[PDB]
Amino acid sequence: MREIVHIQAGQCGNQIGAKFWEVISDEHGIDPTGSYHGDSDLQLERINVYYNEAAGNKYVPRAILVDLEPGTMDSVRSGPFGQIFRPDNFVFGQSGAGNNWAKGHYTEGAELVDSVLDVVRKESESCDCLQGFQLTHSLGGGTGSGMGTLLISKIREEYPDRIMNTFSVVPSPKVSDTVVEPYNATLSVHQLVENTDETYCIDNEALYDICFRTLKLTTPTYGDLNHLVSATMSGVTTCLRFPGQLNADLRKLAVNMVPFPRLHFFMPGFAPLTSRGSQQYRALTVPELTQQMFDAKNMMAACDPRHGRYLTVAAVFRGRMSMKEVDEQMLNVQNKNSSYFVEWIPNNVKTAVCDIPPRGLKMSATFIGNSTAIQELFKRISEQFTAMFRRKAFLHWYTGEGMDEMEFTEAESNMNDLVSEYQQYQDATA
Amino acid sequence: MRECISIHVGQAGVQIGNACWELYCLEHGIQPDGQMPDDSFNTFFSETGAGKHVPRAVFVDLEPTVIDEVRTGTYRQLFHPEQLITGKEDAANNYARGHYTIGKEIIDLVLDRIRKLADQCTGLQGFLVFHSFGGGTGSGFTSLLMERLSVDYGKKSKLEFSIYPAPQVSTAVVEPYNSILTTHTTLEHSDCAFMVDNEAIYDICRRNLDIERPTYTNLNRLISQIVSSITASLRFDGALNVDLTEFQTNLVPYPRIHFPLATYAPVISAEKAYHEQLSVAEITNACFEPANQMVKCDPRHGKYMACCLLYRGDVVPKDVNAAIATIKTKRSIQFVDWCPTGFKVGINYQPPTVVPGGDLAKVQRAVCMLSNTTAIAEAWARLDHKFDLMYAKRAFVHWYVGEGMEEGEFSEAREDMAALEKDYEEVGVD
Ligand SMILES: Nc1nc2c(ncn2[C@@H]2O[C@H](COP(=O)(O)OP(=O)(O)OP(=O)(O)O)[C@@H](O)[C@H]2O)c(=O)[nH]1
Ligand SMILES: Nc1nc2c(ncn2[C@@H]2O[C@H](COP(=O)(O)OP(=O)(O)O)[C@@H](O)[C@H]2O)c(=O)[nH]1
């Protein structure tokens, strides 16, 4: 249970995974060549969770690269710390669908998924104590979402005894490369709501809004959002990358945070607010960080957390603070806003503390929770799909292959049932 | 000849086992190599022809991490590697995985080592085992192991040192489910069991120990002190002695009610050792103090059965009788007509011992009073409230359903624990 297999999907997934690797390597004291050079023994204590011992004393990420457009792998190689990745992990299609799920699912998806199954087996049966897989994937583009769905489905059916995890880049209406987003999102969720067991949705329009207003990034590009989402995801996986009794492995995380088979959708939260290059941030008191988790703009999903009741709560703080003050603050906020939780789930607020703070920071706050606030993403995609399908707009693009809309009806019915489950769990009394 | 066997499961359970074995070897003055600088040590330690002494116990867990640090700790020349068994998969706070999905795949080898170490247990009296209710491994594998040995031998004793989890230290919200499953599946087999409510030890460390914030090391050290005080009668000989069989006779009148609520006193910090220690009467009064037990119960609403005491220090029988007479005048003691007798006396002259460098200071008198009453039903009521508030909505059940289990076992365990608690209150009813 000492190792995790990383998987990438789509371009945006590729750069978010690369940024994840470089930030965690920076905080784990790993040089570009893969040899440890830090001082704290905690980084090397369980580096096997996201790294593998290599030739000499080198440490190599246990990731894999999956896409179809040839430019994604080249961009990954261009970025810093690209070379430290496994050289043979680059699995890319020779044509590239380009946000066109219909062509990339069958014409290029078959051999690609066979090859990725071959490699995942290559480092699975060779692996010692494999536990599960986690993914950084996108949903706005049909191609990357298609690969993500294919890989998760095959690795779930091949490994039913292994924990399933994935991170989703939820499409946003502010920026839309293609308008086929509703179809891809519906098929992806129809696959994952039972295929996956962990889902930290990252909503793009929330990132754009926080960059524009809170972070003053008037022009949020790919890297601008990628820096902050990588910081947040390093914060959330700090539970795993370093020793801690709370959330020892992915399976413990799943059993503690998933109350129902379809309740595996999470609100990401991180504090304090930070950007790329801004060093003007100073030391902040703990109570500010504690109250910061009630802020919508400090979340990574454009929801209304006040409306929902947190079924489960996960939080970690990084730094050297007197954490008795921390759980005093958590008790105070729980007493203040118990109306924002569910009384029938005893003590869903599980929190631990991490000694090492993230890069360019001395105290940090990370928030993870499960509530009905995620249901507004499903409501948004439902109304978008209804608007796009009432006139059957762009349906002929999908039907060019020849499939019917029966599976579309199944997907929409299943997600409406999911929304109903969320609403009934919110309305449930004690 | 009077051999005894101990078992350790779960990270918390095996850690407490390590701590208690450390305090045991300090009690006998056993160096980490096993050098010998009462004869009851042979009941827990096995001596070879070369003079090396190894405890007649075993540390097992589905994860190796704690066993790894044990095998890299400070007792390399003490424990043989074959009584330190590590699994590959993890129960992950799940009774189902720890019992059936992963438990049965290793318990056969576990029984292989148990049988080989029992091959030289001629005078075997019974088995000891440490587990926490919250611990998924310490729940499922504990229940499986207990029922397996009940099948193997039966009348051979199997006494429990359980750890009752607390919300401040709790890691998994599913923990009351595990507690209910353990108590239902072990009630027919646990001849006697001791709980350790971590809220009690938490407040003891906060106030009595004068510690700003309780740590796992300190609370586990004090728990090991309590365990050693309980097991001293087995590990030492005095004028008044109590053994496992007569532990069962004098502590378990009702087969279903096999939860004797013990207590220990006194505790004082190193910095406060400069003050005169409490006398026999003072410590005896401090015994029944509401915040001076291993659980956060309400002794003011209890129906006592019979007193059992464990003096291990400089207590003369005259002081024992004086303390008993003074306690007999207490206004918070209510007895039962079916057990007119209400006192049992055990005195040990061996001075108490504590871990060097710990928070607790050296004392010359100590008391481990043994009690059983309806006051223990408050923790039962708390876990009942948790289980009813969760299982009504069937929260977290799907994780158990995915391991070849149904809701019927949950329901029947619920009514079994309801029958237990109604038995408690009915015995409490005049
Ligand atoms: N008394 C005591 N309890 C602890 C300690 N550490 C953790 N616990 C509690 O014990 C529970 C888990 O018990 P364990 O036996 O260690 O876990 P396990 O049986 O190995 O099961 P898994 O955690 O799923 O592997 C946690 O929820 C904690 O609340 C400790 O040091 N002392
Ligand atoms: N936050 C974030 N979103 C991105 C990034 N790159 C693309 N996106 C979103 O993804 C959508 C396009 O999907 P795309 O990445 O092209 O799919 P793919 O080509 O199959 O991998 C757009 O609507 C963008 O909003 C990025 O670097 N960061």
The verdict on B206 and B343 lying in the same domain is: no
**CA–CA separation, B228 and B235 (whole Å):** 9
Q: Which of A201, A233, A259 delimits the end of a domain?
A: A259
Closest CA to A404 of A392, A414, A415: A392
The verdict on B347 and B421 lying in the same domain is: no
Q: Which atom of ligand 2 is nearest to the CA of A143?
A: 20
**CA–CA separation, A76 and A79 (whole Å):** 5
φ/ψ bin of A98: left (φ > 0), alpha (ψ from -120 to 50), beta (otherwise): left
Look up tokens 């149904």; give the residue: B406
Q: At what angle do helices A10-27 and A70-78 cross, to 10 degrees?
A: 20
Closest CA to A197 of A266, A300, A151: A266
Closest CA to A10 of A81, A128, A97: A97
Which distant-in-sequence residues (6+ apart) come within 8 Å of A425 by Cβ?
Answer: A260, A263, A311, A342, A372, B393
Closest CA to B218 of B264, B269, B168: B269
- What single DSSP character describes residue A145? H
Buried-exposed string B297-325: b where 16+ CB fall within 10 A, e elsewhere: bebeebbbbbbbbbbbbebeeebbeebee
Look up tokens 């809170």; give the residue: A214
**CA–CA separation, A422 and A259 (whole Å):** 12
For residue A100, the CA-to-ligand 2 centroid distance in Å is 13
Contacts 24+ apart (CB under 8 A), A85-88: A85/A18, A85/A21, A85/A60, A85/A61, A86/A60, A86/A61, A86/A62, A88/A119
According to the 3-state scheme, what is the secondary structure of B283-316?
A: HHHHHCCCCCCCCCCCHHHCCCCCEECCEECCCC
Torsions phi, psi for A288 (to 5 deg): -60, -45
The verdict on B270 and B219 lying in the same domain is: no
Across A239-389, where does the E strand assignment appear? 267-271, 312-318, 349-354, 364-370
The verdict on B370 and B272 lying in the same domain is: yes
Q: Which atom of ligand 2 is nearest to the CA of A9?
A: 21
What is the number of domains present in chain A? 3
Closest CA to B328 of B347, B293, B354, B304: B304
**Two tokens, residue A17:** 């995974």
**CA–CA separation, A389 and A386 (whole Å):** 5
Torsions phi, psi for A239 (to 5 deg): -55, -35
How many residues make up chain B in this entry?
Answer: 430
A138 three-class SS: strand
CATH number at residue A194: 3.40.50.1440
**CA–CA separation, A153 and A136 (whole Å):** 15
**CA–CA separation, B47 and B186 (whole Å):** 33
**CA–CA separation, B5 and B44 (whole Å):** 7
The verdict on A160 and A88 lying in the same domain is: yes
Concerning whether B246 is annotated as a catalytic residue, the answer is: yes
Q: Decide if B171 and A260 are in contact by the 8 Å CB cutoff.
A: no
A271 three-class SS: strand
CATH number at residue A379: 1.10.287.600
**CA–CA separation, A245 and B141 (whole Å):** 20
Residue A91's identity, in one-letter code, is V
Which distant-in-sequence residues (6+ apart) come within 8 Å of B299 by Cβ?
Answer: B288, B290, B293, B332, B373, B375
B130, B161 Cβ separation under 8 angstroms: yes
The verdict on A192 and A132 lying in the same domain is: yes
Q: Which helix (H) or strand (E) holds A163?
A: strand A163-164
B209, B7 Cβ separation under 8 angstroms: no
Instruction: Enumerate the β-bridge partners of residue A6.
Output: A134
**Two tokens, residue A379:** 């409501």
Written as one string, the DSSP assignment of A377-394 is HHHHHHHHHHHHHHTTTT
**CA–CA separation, A318 and B213 (whole Å):** 18
B110, B145 Cβ separation under 8 angstroms: yes
Q: Which of B210, B227, B260 delimits the end of a domain?
A: B260
Q: Are strands B343-344 and B307-308 parallel, antiparallel or unpaired?
A: parallel
Task: Say whether residue B26 is in contact with chain A using an 8 A CB cutoff.
Answer: no
According to the 3-state scheme, what is the secondary structure of chain B?
A: CCCCEEEECCHHHHHHHHHHHHHHHHHCCCCCCCCCCCCHHHHCEEECCCCCEEECCCEEECCCHHHHHHHCCCCCCCCCHHHEEECCCCCCCCHHHHHHHCCHHHHHHHHHHHHHHHCCCCCCCEEEEEEECCCHHHHHHHHHHHHHHHHHCCCCEEEEEEEECCCCCCCCCCHHHHHHHHHHHHHCCCCEEECCEHHHHHHHHHHHCCCCCCCHHHHHHHHHHHHHHHHHHHHCCCCCCCCHHHHHHHHCCCCCCCCCCECCECCCECHHHHCCCCCHHHHHHHHCCCCCCCCCCCHHHCCCCCEECCEECCCCHHHHHHHHHHHHCCCCCCCCCCCCCCEECCEECCCCCCCCCCCECCCCCCECCECCCHHHHHHHHHHHHHHHHHHCCCCCHHHHHCCCCCHHHHHHHHHHHHHHHHHHHHHHCC
**CA–CA separation, A259 and A262 (whole Å):** 8
Q: Which of A232, A259, A286 delimits the end of a domain?
A: A259
For residue A170, the CA-to-ligand 2 centroid distance in Å is 9
Q: Which helix (H) or strand (E) holds A202?
A: strand A202-203
Which distant-in-sequence residues (6+ apart) come within 8 Å of A402 by Cβ?
Answer: none
- What single DSSP character describes residue A107? T
According to the 3-state scheme, what is the secondary structure of A343-371?
A: CCCCCCEEEEEECCCCCCCCCEEEEEEEC
- What single DSSP character describes residue A203? E
**CA–CA separation, A315 and A167 (whole Å):** 18
Which distant-in-sequence residues (6+ apart) come within 8 Å of A88 by Cβ?
Answer: A119
The verdict on A415 and A355 lying in the same domain is: no
**CA–CA separation, B401 and B408 (whole Å):** 11
Closest CA to B180 of B131, B130, B128, B134: B134
Q: Beta-carbon neighbour count of residue B38 at 10 Å? A: 11
The verdict on A193 and A146 lying in the same domain is: yes
Task: Say whether residue B179 is in contact with chain A using an 8 A CB cutoff.
Answer: no
**CA–CA separation, A110 and B57 (whole Å):** 55
Sign of CA dihedral B397, B398, B401, B406: positive
A-contacting residues in B 38-77 (Cβ below 8 Å): 63, 65
Which distant-in-sequence residues (6+ apart) come within 8 Å of B328 by Cβ?
Answer: none
Residues near ligand 2 with C-beta < 6 Å? A 10-12, 15, 69, 99, 138, 140-141, 143-144, 169, 171-172, 175-177, 204, 207, 222, 225-226
A255, A245 Cβ separation under 8 angstroms: no
CATH number at residue B315: 3.30.1330.20
A37 three-class SS: coil
Which of B66, B69, B95, B163 is the best mutation target for the ligand 1 pocket, counting ligand atoms within 8 Å of the beta carbon and taking the most? B163
Torsions phi, psi for A166 (to 5 deg): -160, 155
For chain A, how far is it from start to end, CA to CA, in angstroms? 37
Which distant-in-sequence residues (6+ apart) come within 8 Å of A48 by Cβ?
Answer: A2, A3
**CA–CA separation, B178 and B99 (whole Å):** 11
Instruction: Enumerate the β-bridge partners of residue B8.
Output: B59, B130
**CA–CA separation, B220 and B8 (whole Å):** 14
The verdict on B370 and B403 lying in the same domain is: no
Closest CA to B193 of B414, B409, B420, B391: B420
The verdict on B47 and B167 lying in the same domain is: yes
The verdict on A54 and A10 lying in the same domain is: yes
Q: Are strands A5-8 and A132-138 parallel, antiparallel or unpaired?
A: parallel
How far apart, in Å, are the Cα atoms of B114 and each of B58, B127, B214, B244?
Answer: 8, 11, 35, 20
Give the minimum alpha-carbon distance from A9 to chain B in angstroms, rounded to a whole number. 28
CB-CB neighbors (< 8 A) of B168 in chain A:
327
- What single DSSP character describes residue A211? I
A276 three-class SS: coil
**Two tokens, residue B117:** 């170490």
**CA–CA separation, A378 and A414 (whole Å):** 11
Q: Are strands B45-47 and B53-55 parallel, antiparallel or unpaired?
A: antiparallel
The tally of CA atoms less than 13 A away on the side-chain side of residue B69 is 11
Q: Are strands A167-170 and A132-138 parallel, antiparallel or unpaired?
A: parallel
Residue-range definition of the domain harbouring residue B314: 261-375
Contacts 24+ apart (CB under 8 A), B101-105: B101/B403, B101/B404, B102/B62, B102/B140, B103/B140, B103/B141, B103/B144, B104/B144
CB-count burial class (<10 Å; 0-12, 13-18, 19+) for A354: buried
Q: Beta-carbon neighbour count of residue A41 at 10 Å? A: 7
Which distant-in-sequence residues (6+ apart) come within 8 Å of B125 by Cβ?
Answer: B2, B3, B4, B156, B157, B243, B244, B245
Share of chain A residues as helix, strand and coil, in percent rounded to the nearest 5? 45, 15, 40
How far apart, in Å, are the Cα atoms of A172 and each of A210, A302, B276?
Answer: 14, 10, 71
The verdict on A27 and A150 lying in the same domain is: yes
**CA–CA separation, B332 and A170 (whole Å):** 63
Task: Compare CB distances from B395 to A2, A245, A260 and report the shortest one's residue.
Answer: A260
The verdict on B190 and B243 lying in the same domain is: yes
CATH number at residue B227: 3.40.50.1440
Residue A179's identity, in one-letter code, is V
Q: Which of A259, A289, A307 delimits the end of a domain?
A: A259
Task: Say whether residue B390 is in contact with chain A using an 8 A CB cutoff.
Answer: yes
Task: Compare CB distances from B90 to A1, A261, A343 and report the shortest one's residue.
Answer: A1
Closest CA to B70 of B56, B55, B62, B59: B59
CATH number at residue B382: 1.10.287.600
How far apart, in Å, are the Cα atoms of A378 and each of A145, A147, A189, A372?
Answer: 16, 21, 9, 10
B244, B256 Cβ separation under 8 angstroms: no
Residue numbers followed by a gap, chain B, C–N over 2.5 Å: 37
Instruction: Enumerate the β-bridge partners of residue B157.
Output: B126
**CA–CA separation, A365 and A321 (whole Å):** 12
Nearest CA in chain A to B400: A255
The verdict on B53 and B34 lying in the same domain is: yes
Q: Cα dihedral angle (B131, B135, B141, B147), rounded to 10 degrees?
A: 60
CB-CB neighbors (< 8 A) of A348 in chain B:
173
Closest CA to B95 of B146, B55, B57, B129: B146
A8 three-class SS: strand
How many residues make up chain A in this entry?
Answer: 430
For residue A324, the CA-to-ligand 2 centroid distance in Å is 42
- What single DSSP character describes residue A282? -
Q: Which helix (H) or strand (E) holds A188?
A: helix A181-195
The verdict on B286 and B400 lying in the same domain is: no
Residue-range definition of the domain harbouring residue A334: 260-373
**CA–CA separation, A291 and A271 (whole Å):** 10
The verdict on B423 and B351 lying in the same domain is: no
Cis, bond preceding A80 (omega within 30 deg of 0) = no
Closest CA to A270 of A217, A317, A209, A227: A317
Nearest residue by C-alpha to atom 10 in ligand 2: A140
The verdict on A169 and A52 lying in the same domain is: yes
**CA–CA separation, A29 and A37 (whole Å):** 5
Which distant-in-sequence residues (6+ apart) come within 8 Å of B65 by Cβ?
Answer: A2, B11
- CA B324 from centre of chain: 26
The verdict on A161 and A269 lying in the same domain is: no
Instruction: Enumerate the β-bridge partners of residue A367.
Output: A269, A315
Residue A374's identity, in one-letter code, is I
How far apart, in Å, are the Cα atoms of A140 and each of A219, A224, B106?
Answer: 19, 18, 46
Buried-exposed string A74-89: b where 16+ CB fall within 10 A, e elsewhere: ebbeebebbebbbeeb
Look up tokens 């489950």; give the residue: A421
**CA–CA separation, B312 and B367 (whole Å):** 7
- The ligand with the least distance to the CA atom of B195 is 1
In a mutational test of the A interface, the residue from B133, B170, B171, B398 whose CB has the highest number of chain A CBs within 10 Å is B171
What is the number of domains present in chain B? 3
For chain B, how far is it from start to end, CA to CA, in angstroms? 45
The verdict on B4 and B120 lying in the same domain is: yes
Q: At what angle do helices A142-158 and A10-27 cross, to 10 degrees?
A: 70
How far apart, in Å, are the Cα atoms of A237 and each of A198, A233, A234, A241?
Answer: 12, 6, 5, 6
**CA–CA separation, A257 and A55 (whole Å):** 38
Which distant-in-sequence residues (6+ apart) come within 8 Å of B354 by Cβ?
Answer: B23, B221, B225, B360, B361, B362
**Two tokens, residue B190:** 């646990």
Torsions phi, psi for B243 (to 5 deg): -115, 175
The verdict on B291 and B354 lying in the same domain is: yes
Which distant-in-sequence residues (6+ apart) come within 8 Å of A91 by Cβ?
Answer: A64, A65, A66, A67, A112, A115, A116, A119
**CA–CA separation, A170 and A168 (whole Å):** 6
